[PDB]
Design a protein around this ligand. Structure first.
Ligand code: CLA
Ligand code: CLA
Ligand code: CLA
Ligand code: CLA
Ligand code: CLA
Ligand code: CLA
Ligand code: CLA
Ligand SMILES: CCCCCCCCCCCC(=O)OC\C(C#C[C@@]12O[C@]1(C)C[C@@H](O)CC2(C)C)=C/C=C/C(C)=C/C=C/C=C(C)/C=C/C=C(\C)C=C=C1C(C)(C)C[C@H](OC(C)=O)C[C@@]1(C)O
Ligand SMILES: CC(=O)O[C@H]1CC(C)(C)C(=C=C/C(C)=C/C=C/C(C)=C/C=C/C=C(C)/C=C/C=C(\C)C(=O)C[C@@]23O[C@]2(C)C[C@@H](O)CC3(C)C)[C@](C)(O)C1
Ligand SMILES: CC(=O)O[C@H]1CC(C)(C)C(=C=C/C(C)=C/C=C/C(C)=C/C=C/C=C(C)/C=C/C=C(\C)C(=O)C[C@@]23O[C@]2(C)C[C@@H](O)CC3(C)C)[C@](C)(O)C1
Lengths: 48, 189, 193, 183, 40, 107, 193
């Protein structure tokens, strides 16, 4: 496996993203965990 | 009368706050009077726990926005669900829950009055505050940093979701424009 | 302190307290200390603003480059008003950061100018004695001890001169900005103001 | 400001096991305070028995991966699969011999109320010291602490080995080689 | 916990409910892992 | 009109998964005769988030009532003269409970 | 001990305590013994690191074979940055195991440096006095008794020298790594780094 520092880098840099365009209020709400997103509030109660 | 030295149109007639200076940073700030219905030691323990958790959370939020381990190729806002599906959050919950069960026994013994001041686990391996003159000063610094980190983490998550950018957590017109402009502004940015 | 024993007075308004609206008589001493501190800060800000606005209006620029790709003369190619918007946002943020640090350290000093301190007497080292922060001992006012050769009478006379020049400088910088925003108001500004 | 705190966890009141004179009682590690309820001598005997079983179990788990008996009926170097591969009569006889050994090693001293009735039976002393290490009395304490710490370490180790085999389906050192493989 | 909360938890109904819950859980998990067993 | 309401699912352990009948809509569960579905439809609860937040608010209110019950017996227990104000109790119930509940529900 | 009675000082900072942020003024003495031990360990590690990075940058490799099939020069073919990843994994594990054993042994020495020991003074024989652990009596620091011909004053002078070279080497190795990662940062660092 990929052990950091040994056969892998210690900290891989996160991919950088340009800044722009406050998306919508109805965009992140319809994929949130509590408000809206009926397929994701059904994804909060555990996996096991 | 003894007015509260943080509101001072209201007294310290919230006498559930206790004597002045019993806790560090006691400026008599209890407008809603939560101390009337709850013990002061339990509220203090909750406050200090929130302070330390929010400090670690703010640092981790910024660091995950900057760097990550190999194999954790996830952004900060999606690391939660992705590592839940991966399984690391279960390990975090298990070990933190073990430490917090021990903390629960500690709070049970403290509220019954064994010996404990709230938030004190004796965890000072580096011996920063082994001098008793510097104990009372580092407590206030810990508090103020924790409160500021609470507000900082709230702002971090809310602006990260609201805008959708990395560590500055600012809109496009606040970084790719001019905020200290003095010319006649338009009607949008 | 009391408005009677202050250094404004001046021979222009005869030699008595000018106040026609009775602001200083309706308020207590603490408000008078705040008013003197605000007046002196306003005068110093306005003096620097007047000198900088005249320099920008005369199209005088530094020989060099402001930002890599942006010459000083490129920013100064227009009037002083359309030069602040040509400075990069990072440079203006650094200027405001230094100004914020100076204001915060100035007000953080002890005997606040309401609570015992002298209004307008900004002490020499605002960044001294602060834990976790270090600065060289460059003084804020007089890094060179120019006002160490003066006596008390010369210092009082030059403080009066400072107050008069501050009032004139506030009038001047407000005239400059109003003449740019509303042309034809101040007739003394030809085009480049 | 606890007047009598635990040596291990200083934010907790001292457990009753710290006041005991047993080996390893200097550390006050009992956050759940099970020494308040369970008898300390019975728990020490149980801990030592589990520790010894786990030492033998860890050694057997390690040695079974590489070595084998010369022609055993079903070797399968995977000790989770090995217990089902081997004949069941072997397990029956092994469990029978262990049953005989521990039926005779304490003839009437089962249960909590009957084992430590004599105030000379110290916990974990079944009399099994043929080589007479325990006649020195200077290294008795260090040997007791070595046995206790090695037993606890063997408990944790055998649990890790068993669950690593469960999550990998392979023996220990094959899984370890697959951890330190290349990428 | 406390010296008197544990005594309440040691009462007959609490211990009966806890032990019956443990027994029911053990039997239900046995039925989950080894279902539909008629013979031995 | 063709989907049968169902809000109760059983765990398959012992063969009791036969109780998860075909109630329609690609769902398996025990049919519900409480009428809570029609009660929610009469309130305009067409979304499944509002049911979750109503459940969370109900849990919060239950915790509030537990705290109030502890508080009024161990901290602030009213005297006998408080309970015997039957005219005040009657006025407050008739207006504030019933009439204000009707007014708020009509709104 | 107290930060005033230590061996840091130095003529570069004039002969007084350098600390501009007051780190030792908000912490206890038990903290500054740890600070001294951490500083000396950092200095020693970075002195070895600077010498090794310079050797790798000069492409000076041992004559022979690192692992059978892998030449020293094959690993040192690229720069020192692309050299730790070319070491065989077993060799890295053995180096880390030796460092693990050394750190555990040196910390388990009796009078800890936070409870009465001297900070930065490593025990001469870290693997000695441990029952069930036989090692030869090779000393960790100074096996061939070089610092036995020195007096107390020469030892104090060379300790001051050790602290100064350790700080300089820390700055140097950070300069090396940063100059490789960000080109043009350290301009003295040309290509072979
Ligand atoms: C047994 C497995 C193993 C091994 C042999 C190593 C070995 C190494 N890791 Mg490492 N690592 C591991 C697991 C392992 N890691 C895991 C599971 C994680 C995820 C949490 C990391 C995350 C990690 C990071 C983020 C970094 C390393 C780094 C390093 C290297 C320098 C070590 C150092 O400076 O420590 C110095 C000694 C200490 C810090 C004392 C603390 C000892 C432990 C952590 C307590 C070294 C080769 C560093 C590197 O790449 O340098 C080349 C580095 O930046 N590792
Ligand atoms: C007590 C030791 C211990 C052990 C054995 C584990 C075991 C595991 N953790 Mg883990 N964890 C622990 C403590 C531990 N955790 C603690 C204290 C925290 C912080 C609260 C976490 C936080 C954590 C996270 C966030 C994640 C794990 C994950 C994992 C799994 C990794 C699976 C894999 O492919 O291995 C990877 C193997 C390697 C990278 C090889 C290097 C690892 C070396 C060998 C570990 C060194 C030994 C270890 C410290 C045991 C203690 C030894 C003792 C002497 C102290 C595994 C089940 C991950 C998971 O669930 O994924 C399935 C994951 O994402 N853990
Ligand atoms: C905002 C700047 C400012 C402030 C805080 C002060 C404050 C003070 N002045 Mg001062 N002054 C100023 C600007 C200012 N001045 C300017 C620009 C002039 C030139 C005309 C003067 C000329 C002047 C004289 C001649 C004297 C004072 C005196 C005083 C002191 C007592 C008077 C008092 O209580 O008024 C308090 C003042 C205020 C609360 C400010 C209110 C301003 C209102 C809100 C706005 C009105 C502005 C108006 C619309 C004109 C704007 C256009 C303009 C460009 C022409 C007091 C410390 C007297 C003194 O020092 O005696 C000891 C005195 O003799 N001043
Ligand atoms: C990552 C976030 C972070 C962290 C870890 C800390 C940590 C700390 N802060 Mg702090 N702080 C932060 C963010 C943070 N702060 C922010 C955003 C603010 C608002 C501007 C503050 C405002 C603040 C105040 C007002 C005070 C602290 C103090 C302290 C210290 C408490 C006790 C102490 O050591 O005093 C002893 C002090 C020291 C040991 C000082 C050493 C710290 C130096 C500056 C470290 C050098 C860092 C280096 C420049 C790299 C940073 C790069 C960065 C600038 C980009 C502690 C080290 C208190 C203090 O005493 O510190 C001065 C204090 O009075 N903080
Ligand atoms: C307008 C004021 C008012 C209101 C709303 C109530 C309401 C109630 N009283 Mg009460 N009471 C009042 C004045 C009032 N009382 C006064 C003045 C006296 C003294 C004379 C009493 C003495 C009294 C006694 C002695 C008892 C009650 C009981 C009850 C409950 C009856 C059970 C029931 O119908 O469940 C309906 C349940 C609900 C409506 C759920 C809501 C519960 C909250 C607490 C109601 C108020 C919420 C809030 C004010 C509205 C916020 C609006 C916001 C969303 C905009 C009910 C909650 C009995 C009881 O159950 O005790 C607990 C009881 O034994 N009352
Ligand atoms: C992390 C390494 C480290 C540590 C632990 C120490 C520790 C100490 N130094 Mg020291 N020092 C270091 C590195 C370090 N130094 C380096 C690299 C230099 C050269 C610039 C010096 C130069 C120096 C002088 C000249 C003196 C000391 C003194 C002291 C002692 C008291 C000051 C104090 O409280 O420091 C506490 C220090 C820390 C807690 C370290 C905090 C570091 C922060 C987190 C990072 C800030 C660095 C910043 C990012 C810049 C990095 C770039 C760099 C390459 C330039 C103390 C034992 C004084 C002394 O011994 O008096 C008797 C003294 O006179 N040091
Ligand atoms: C005498 C030494 C020296 C000199 C002349 C410079 C010179 C310069 N550095 Mg630099 N730097 C140095 C040491 C030095 N650095 C050290 C020791 C470090 C590590 C702490 C750095 C880290 C560093 C960074 C991270 C950056 C510079 C940058 C710069 C440039 C502005 C300029 C070329 C900046 C630059 O232009 O990089 C291309 C820049 O971003 N330097
Ligand atoms: C390399 C150098 C290194 C440094 C060396 C030392 C540096 C020295 C140093 O920096 O000290 C700076 C310094 C100093 C000093 C001393 O300490 C020194 C050095 C030695 C020591 O013994 C003595 C002192 C003094 C303490 C003073 C500064 C004073 C200032 C800036 C006052 C600024 C004052 C601006 C005004 C009045 C603006 C006016 C605007 C007007 C009137 C505008 C206008 C107009 C017009 C357009 C004109 C015309 C129009 O007309 C109509 C329409 O009618 C009317 C009106 C109103 O519209
Ligand atoms: C020690 C001592 O004694 O101190 C000294 C200090 C100092 C400086 C040396 C002194 C001096 C001398 C000087 C040079 C004094 C200068 C005074 C000067 C030059 C004062 C200009 C005013 C211009 C105004 C009010 C413009 C109004 C503008 C107005 C009212 C408008 O048109 C606004 C308006 O069109 C808008 C914008 C649109 C609509 O809203 C409608 C209206 C029409 C309402 C003194 C006085 O001797 C005292
Ligand atoms: C006994 C005694 O006295 O000890 C002595 C020891 C010793 C060694 C002899 C001494 C010395 C002398 C020397 C030579 C000291 C040398 C010190 C040296 C050479 C120190 C370099 C710093 C370089 C830095 C901080 C680079 C910053 C770089 C920065 C901050 C960045 O650009 C970051 C940034 O770019 C990112 C990453 C992303 C951007 O989006 C944002 C920005 C642009 C902000 C002393 C001091 O006399 C003390």
């Amino acid at each position: 496996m990929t052990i950091p520092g040994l056969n892998a880098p210690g900290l891989v840099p996160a991919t950088k993203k340009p800044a722009g365009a406050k998306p919508s209020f109805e965009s992140y709400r319809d994929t949130s965990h509590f408000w809206s997103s009926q397929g994701i509030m059904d994804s909060v109660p555990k996996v096991k | 009368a003894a007015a509260a030295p943080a509101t001072e149109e209201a007294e310290e007639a919230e006498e559930s706050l206790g004597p002045v200076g019993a806790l560090v940073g006691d400026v008599g700030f209890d407008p809603l009077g939560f101390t009337e219905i709850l013990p002061l030691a339990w509220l203090r323990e909750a406050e200090i726990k929130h302070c330390r958790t929010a400090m670690l959370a703010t640092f981790g939020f910024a660091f995950t926005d900057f760097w990550h381990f190999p194999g954790f190729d996830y952004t900060t806002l999606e690391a939660h669900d992705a590592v839940i599906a991966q399984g690391g959050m279960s390990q975090l919950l298990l070990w933190i829950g073990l430490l917090e069960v021990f903390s629960a026994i500690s709070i049970d013994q403290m509220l019954r009055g064994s010996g404990r001041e709230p938030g004190d686990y004796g965890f000072d391996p580096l011996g920063f505050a082994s001098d008793p003159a510097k104990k009372a000063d580092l407590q206030m610094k810990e508090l103020a940093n924790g409160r500021l980190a609470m507000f900082a983490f709230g702002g971090f998550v809310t602006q990260s979701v609201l805008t959708g950018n990395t560590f500055p957590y600012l809109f496009d017109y606040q970084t790719a424009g001019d905020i200290v402009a003095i010319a006649a502004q338009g009607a949008s940015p | 302190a009391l408005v009677d024993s202050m250094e404004g007075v001046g021979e222009e308004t005869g030699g008595q307290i000018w106040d026609p609206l009775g602001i200083s008589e309706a308020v207590s001493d603490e408000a008078v200390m705040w008013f003197r501190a605000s007046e002196l800060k306003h005068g110093r800000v306005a003096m620097l603003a007047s000198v900088g606005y005249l320099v920008g209006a005369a199209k005088i620029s530094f020989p060099g480059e402001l930002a890599k790709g942006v010459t000083f003369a490129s920013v100064a190619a227009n009037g002083p008003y359309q030069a602040w918007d040509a400075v990069p946002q990072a440079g203006k943020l650094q200027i405001l950061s230094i100004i914020l640090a100076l204001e915060w350290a100035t007000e953080a000093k002890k005997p606040h100018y309401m609570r015992g301190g002298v209004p307008g007497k900004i002490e020499q080292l605002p960044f001294d004695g602060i834990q976790g922060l270090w600065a060289p001992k460059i003084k804020f006012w007089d890094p060179l001890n120019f006002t160490g050769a003066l006596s008390a009478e010369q210092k009082a006379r030059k403080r009066k001169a400072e107050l008069k020049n501050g009032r004139l400088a506030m009038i001047g910088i407000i005239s400059f900005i109003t003449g740019h925003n509303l042309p034809g108001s101040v007739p003394a500004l030809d085009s480049s103001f | 400001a606890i007047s009598k705190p635990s040596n291990a966890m200083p934010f907790l009141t001292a457990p009753p096991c710290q006041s005991s004179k047993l080996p390893g009682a200097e550390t006050g590690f009992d956050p759940l305070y099970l020494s308040e309820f369970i008898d300390i001598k019975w728990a020490r005997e149980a801990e030592l028995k589990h520790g010894r079983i786990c030492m033998l179990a860890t050694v057997g788990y390690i040695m079974q991966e590489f070595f084998s008996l010369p022609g055993y009926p079903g070797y399968t170097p995977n000790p989770i699969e090995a217990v089902s591969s081997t004949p069941p009569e072997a397990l029956a006889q092994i469990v029978l011999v262990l049953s005989i050994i521990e039926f005779n090693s304490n003839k009437d001293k089962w249960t909590m109320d009957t084992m430590f009735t004599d105030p000379a039976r110290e916990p974990g002393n079944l009399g099994f010291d043929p080589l007479k290490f325990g006649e020195n009395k200077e290294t008795r304490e260090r040997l007791a602490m070595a046995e206790l710490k090695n037993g606890r370490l063997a408990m944790i180790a055998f649990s890790g080995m068993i669950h690593q085999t469960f999550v990998t389906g392979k023996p220990l050192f094959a899984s370890l080689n697959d951890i330190f493989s290349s990428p | 916990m406390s010296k008197d909360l544990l005594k309440y938890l040691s009462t007959a109904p609490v211990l009966l409910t806890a032990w019956m819950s443990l027994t029911a859980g053990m039997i239900i998990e046995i039925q989950r892992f080894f279902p539909d067993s008629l013979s031995f | 009109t063709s989907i049968k309401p169902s809000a109760q699912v059983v765990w398959p352990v012992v063969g009791q998964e036969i109780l998860n009948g075909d109630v329609g809509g690609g769902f398996s569960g025990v049919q519900i005769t409480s009428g809570v579905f029609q009660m929610w439809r009469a309130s305009g609860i067409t979304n499944e988030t509002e049911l979750y937040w109503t459940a969370m608010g109900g849990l919060m209110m239950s915790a509030l009532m537990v705290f109030a019950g502890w508080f009024h017996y161990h901290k602030a227990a009213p005297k006998l003269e408080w309970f015997q104000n039957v005219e005040s109790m009657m006025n407050h119930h008739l207006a504030g409970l019933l009439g204000l509940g009707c007014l708020s529900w009509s709104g």
